[PDB]
Amino acid sequence: SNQALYEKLEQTRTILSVKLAELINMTTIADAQENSELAVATTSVMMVNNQTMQLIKNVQDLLILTRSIKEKWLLNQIPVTRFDEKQIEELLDNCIETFVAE
Amino acid sequence: MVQQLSLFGSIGDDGYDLLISTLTTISGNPPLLYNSLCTVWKPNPSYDVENVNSRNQLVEPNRIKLSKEVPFSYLIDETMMDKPLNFRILKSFTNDKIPLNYAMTRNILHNTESCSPWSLQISDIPAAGNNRSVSMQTIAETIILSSAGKNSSVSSLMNGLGYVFEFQYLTIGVKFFMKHGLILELQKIWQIEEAGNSQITSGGFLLKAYINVSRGTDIDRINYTETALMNLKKELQGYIELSVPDRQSMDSRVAH
Amino acid sequence: MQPPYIQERLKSLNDIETQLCSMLQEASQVTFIFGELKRGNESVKPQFENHVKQFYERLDKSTTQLRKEIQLLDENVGTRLLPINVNKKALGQDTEKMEEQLDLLSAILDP
């Protein structure tokens, strides 16, 4: 479990580090190559419907990982007088003496 | 005739307190400090014996051991009266230095009238059937309540049986009576000798998780206790390794 | 109340969560200001540079913080955590109830 969080955070980080950069990068106009309206339409739908909410799933997975390790920190903790016997006996004797009322 | 289904393991001295906390969480019972002086007696070499017994079956000579609880006043080195008797005492016992020297054990054995209670145990080699995942051993046990007479000393009494003293050892540890009648010991072992005490478990604790079953023919009870022991190995899996020790190590018979 | 190491880990994880929430603020700001500089505006160029460099450095800070948080979780597995998974037991509640009832007796007997 705790080993999987390492590569999970690693892969989320390494796709967040390049995804916005490639989002800006592929908006390149040239006569990659978009010789028709179809390439323009599919790029302008794939950016919104493939990059932005995949960033949303990235930060949501990061939220899930942080919540999981927070719960792991909370739950897995290792666990770490005033009245002496004579005083308890005196209190009990006085209390019985008052309660019976002989 | 008690069958002893047991598992064994080892920890370092540094991981002692973490294991105490872990087994306190698992058991729900606090650790209890315990000690026992075990004196092992071998048959007299000057006596010519027979391989057969009163029956026509062959019998090997076996060392037998007596044990009793030494009071903890004999094990405190005039530094730990303020510290209460709990699991924290074993953190101090690291070197060979134990207040129980050889002379005090000889005073215990020679009783220098009536003797303290002892526990005579005879154990054979564990079973060789390679279908059991725990070390199953048979222990013949009796309780010596007292003694009297001009030779009331347990050394002379054991010489009366034909048995001579071979060696003795002192073990101090903490134990957990867990759920389903499982006892989990965590003990140091010191050998008591005339040349000086020797810590056998040097810088570490010997771990013993055993269940005692009275009837060896109750295969349902044996399997129930074996499943309990494998369960306990499963919660402790990864942290500490519990395994069946070699049967040649647990053979108490006299070799020749 | 709770160990201060738990306080450090709790507050650091909450800080990580807020930092990765503001990740989305600054990503939205980057795409916003890129949209305005695609309209022909050029005065928003240094603010766009500020937003992208802030984006990358806050990504680095959040990822390094989470990485050392996972390191501290995997390091304190013996120091202040259980090395195995086991449900703990509520111990000593009987002593607390005894102390409560004896305090009640001390209240009732002596006015």
Next chain:
Amino acid sequence: AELPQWYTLQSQLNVTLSQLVSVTSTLQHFQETLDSTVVYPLPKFPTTSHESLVTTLLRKKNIPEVDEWMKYVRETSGVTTALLKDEEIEKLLQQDREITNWARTTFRNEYGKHDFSKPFNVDDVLKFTFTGEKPII
């Protein structure tokens, strides 16, 4: 009436998007020799009782929604053709491409600035406790 759990449907959406980008990659990589092939029906096709079948079979006039949204997109670009001369559009697109190059090299240098046990033997101890042999070290 009951939706599947969201990860499976998200995977379906992603694989459909990948399938369509494969479709347009195949079509755009074979852009020419597909502009050059015009389709006409054959006499074997029923063009009297089933010409309604073929008129919505070769149609390139798309649905009104996509091109009304396309014309809405056209006017929101901030620059048009009807009141600007064509070389002004050419130089505006050229400087926009230069701005894309500057932005992607800004992203590139900002990305490249940063980085992306056993104390004893149990058997020997037990052999001591059962036999008396000292643990040899």
Next chain:
Amino acid sequence: TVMTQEQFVKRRRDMLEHINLAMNESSLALEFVSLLLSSVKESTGMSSMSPFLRKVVKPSSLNSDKIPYVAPTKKEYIELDILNKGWKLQSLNESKDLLRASFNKLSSILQNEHDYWNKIMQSISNKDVIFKIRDGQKLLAIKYGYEDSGSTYKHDRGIANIRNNIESQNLDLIPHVKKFLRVRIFTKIESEDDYILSGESVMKDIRKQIQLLKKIIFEKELMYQIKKECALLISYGVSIENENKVIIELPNEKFEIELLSLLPKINDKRANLMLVMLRLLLVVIFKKTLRSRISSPHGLINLNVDDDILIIRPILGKVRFANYKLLLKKIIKDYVLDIVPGSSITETEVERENIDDENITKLNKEIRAFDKLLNIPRRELKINLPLSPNLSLMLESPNYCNALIHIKFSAGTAVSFDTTFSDFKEVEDFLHFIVAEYIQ
């Protein structure tokens, strides 16, 4: 924001219609390209056809021919480029709006979660135990039961689900009604009539709620063990009325231990004292059971009623022994002090009375602290006489509701008696014989 069922089904239907149109356009495109394929191949295109289409039109009915290669003009190049720029700008604006809305949602969710975690920290100490639980969602449940702290009560384990209430700004425990048990002391007037009450016992935040839940389960366990004990005391005027209220009948008083949900009287103090006796005796049972579980491998899994409960037996035996001592004093006065010319009845309490470890010794001293309440009430009553006759009466109750009189008598004018009685008329006529035979 809030979204409704009709809005949900409207959105479902409109996305369903849009995807219907999507598959329709894609299917006509595929069916067209396979129709044109079947002209030249006839093998692979026939697989993706529609049966109705093959019914209405035969394949190989389309043909294509090559128009010459043409270089596209720059006018539609710049048209496509400006449309590309517009599409990119519109996509960027849509992405900005999506990211802003998702940030607002995430910020509200993170504020709620951080408030929850701060409430968890300021609410839960490390002494408490929490574990995950399913409904199938993850919920943190705190174990407040006494079953791992000495109790043997499998009917109701103390498990409470911790829930976050943002409106209340506090954590509320849902047990996975406030009924505290109270006692009533009913005195009897000196006319052998109906009992009138003379006294009765007295009747937010996270830690207060945990303490209240522990108190509730403790009172429920106490009432359960009281009800289990009363069946052994049915012969001594102890009746179970309605499985939540028991009554103790006495010749001059009446105790009503009732478990119920929801001005200074004379016996209110004694009622409060009796209530704390009941709670402390249950604590003593918990300590004894914990000692048995700690000091033995098997432990006490179940409680034997006549041996391990001892809740109403000691506190009933105190007042029962007080009544017995009053009766014995009256009998001794009438049959000796009204007869002899001066003697004093003197009462003296008589008493009779390894595993070295901090936990075991602490448990032993905690249990022995309550020994003066838990033990059998015993008292030796000795009367002096003019000289040389010696007479003593050791009154005890080996069963807590019983009565044994161990009278010992000797005289110098010789005789020596050591006899035990289980009743009081035997004491009466025995003393009447003794005074006339030896004192008179």
